[PDB]
């Protein structure tokens, strides 16, 4: 009964909001990621780092606010408040992008905290830890997109900024520069996310429409007792329905719910791999055989070559304002344009 | 177009001509499928975590469920107990029927809105 | 002097179907990039 | 089209090898 065993006892008390040892990492880091974002979308500009208004104070709305990334000249600085860039000056820290790394890194450790919390609570309650395991996919996305991707490029400037429209800009950037829709790792990611939503809808609906009549009311939610032994819907009838509608059906409830964790988890992991490649500009940009023929044969057109003309438009029209540290100056006459438009 | 790259052509030109990213119904579609994947991984991982021991360490646990068995193969009381403490007790479902209606409803409405 | 830890291995028919389909679709996906 | 000659052998083995793996396991499951 050391001071350790007594501290352990209090952290692991049953209360409205379980704390645990993981709480010491989770609650401060989550709270500061959150507070950093709200603070920054509410009061902080992106003027000196991007040339952009980015807070309510400056007149932005919920969609257009962001905690933007630091200037490209900071490189990958940790941008600590006491570091050599701000030198402990908080107002200049905000102006230089410090809240972005502040959110990025506290949030990173907040996610660790959350995953540890899922292990901690799982262990105390006596359940297998598959929910912690599923959470490895969100973590892999966060790390590959917010950390690895900028680490491979010139600076954090090119990481995602923390905002609704900032993220859309990131999407489009990835289209015109990385040709990311063409990447088989993203395609697997789409399949696992859309596949996951499909499984969510189809399973939820199947159970809701094979329920047994366990009560006499029209509202069927009351005829379920959380301690009853019996299945509340018919695996057998569901099974026959899908066998005859779609050709095959689940027959094993454990395999079904493992398949439901597997699909979206595997989907996000695959997409994370593709972004690691894009850290290096290691893209699937082109099909070489199509380019060789296209160069030689001015009549060969496909949807692939058409999409590449669109990327060439995104790059040249968005680059000067998107990447202002480059001082790109593009006269009207060099801008790619079709006829009339 | 009925094609993989043709689908992308379609999406890019739609964005130019309509700012679908900036349209709340597409934002609801994203919430619908991100969230549907989320709740898919959640539900799978939570039923999977609370499977009753019916097998040894050398066999797939999937052999612990038998097609048509009357009893449930997982302890939803344990899953609610785990998940109620992960957030708080009322953020978590105690009623399979509510829980599965939620799973059906969320992505379906999302996709209605984006359609 | 037989070894006590040997175990038989199984793969049921449904797992074959799932696995065969995984591999075929992965091939359909990645082949365009292998040819390039 | 000036595709990559080794693409064919890469696709062929990508399919062949793991497929055979599954078939071997499946067949020796049925015969017991």
């Amino acid at each position: 009964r050391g001071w350790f065993d007594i501290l352990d006892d209090w952290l692991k008390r049953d209360r409205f909001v379980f704390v645990g040892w993981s709480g010491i990492l989770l609650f401060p880091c989550a709270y500061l990621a959150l507070g950093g974002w709200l603070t920054g979308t509410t009061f902080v500009t992106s003027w000196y780092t991007h040339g952009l208004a980015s807070s309510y104070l400056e007149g932005c709305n919920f969609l257009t606010v962001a905690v933007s990334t630091p200037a490209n000249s900071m490189g990958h600085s940790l941008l600590l408040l006491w570091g050599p860039e701000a030198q402990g000056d908080f107002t200049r820290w905000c102006q230089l992008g410090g809240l972005w790394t502040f959110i990025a890194l506290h949030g990173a450790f907040g996610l660790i905290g959350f995953m540890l919390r899922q292990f901690e609570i799982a262990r105390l309650v006596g359940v297998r830890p598959y929910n912690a395991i599923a959470f490895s996919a969100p973590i892999a996305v966060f790390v590959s997109v917010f950390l690895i991707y900028p680490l491979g490029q010139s600076s954090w400037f090119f990481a995602p900024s923390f905002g609704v429209a900032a993220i859309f800009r990131f999407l489009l950037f990835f289209q015109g520069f990385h040709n990311w829709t063409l990447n088989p790792f993203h395609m697997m990611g789409v399949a696992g996310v859309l596949g996951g939503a499909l499984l969510c809808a189809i399973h939820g609906a199947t159970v809701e429409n094979t329920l047994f009549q366990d009560g006499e009311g029209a509202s069927t939610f009351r005829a379920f007792n959380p301690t009853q032994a019996e299945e509340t819907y018919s695996m057998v009838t569901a099974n026959r329905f899908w066998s005859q509608i779609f050709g095959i059906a689940f027959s094993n409830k454990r395999w079904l719910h493992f398949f439901m964790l597997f699909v979206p988890v595997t989907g996000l992991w695959m997409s994370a791999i593709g972004v690691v490649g894009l850290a290096l500009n290691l893209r699937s940009y082109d099909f070489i055989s199509q380019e060789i023929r296209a160069a030689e044969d001015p009549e060969f057109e496909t949807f692939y070559t058409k999409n590449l003309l669109l990327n060439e438009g995104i790059r040249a029209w968005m680059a000067p304002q998107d990447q202002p540290h480059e001082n790109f100056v593009f006269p009207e006459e060099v801008l790619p344009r079709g006829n009339a438009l | 177009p009925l094609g993989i790259s043709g689908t992308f052509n379609f999406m890019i030109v739609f964005q130019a001509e309509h700012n679908i990213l900036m349209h709340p119904f597409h934002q609801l579609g994203v919430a619908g499928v991100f969230g549907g994947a989320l709740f898919c991984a959640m539900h799978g991982s939570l039923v999977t975590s609370s499977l009753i021991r019916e097998t040894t360490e050398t066999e797939s646990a999937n052999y612990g469920y038998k097609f048509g068995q009357e009893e449930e193969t997982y302890n939803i009381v344990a899953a609610h107990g785990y998940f109620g403490r992960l957030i708080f007790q009322y953020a978590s479902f105690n009623n399979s029927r509510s829980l599965h209606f939620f799973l059906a409803a969320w992505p379906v409405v999302g996709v209605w809105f984006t359609a | 002097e037989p070894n006590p830890n040997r175990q038989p291995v199984e793969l049921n028919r449904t797992s074959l179907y799932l696995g065969l389909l995984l591999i075929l679709v992965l091939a359909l996906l990645f082949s365009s990039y292998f040819f390039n | 089209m000036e595709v990559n000659q080794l693409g064919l052998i890469a696709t062929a083995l990508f399919v062949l090898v793991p497929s055979v793996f599954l078939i071997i396991l499946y067949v020796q499951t049925e015969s017991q």
Binding site: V236 | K66 | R13, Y17, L21, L24, F35 | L8, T11, V15
Partner: peptide
Amino acid sequence: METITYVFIFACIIALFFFAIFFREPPRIT
């Protein structure tokens, strides 16, 4: 050769569908 490969793989998947539906392990109730 590339057209044949794409079509070969697609053809095999459709065969797989047939066996997967008509020659499945039959689900049984015990």
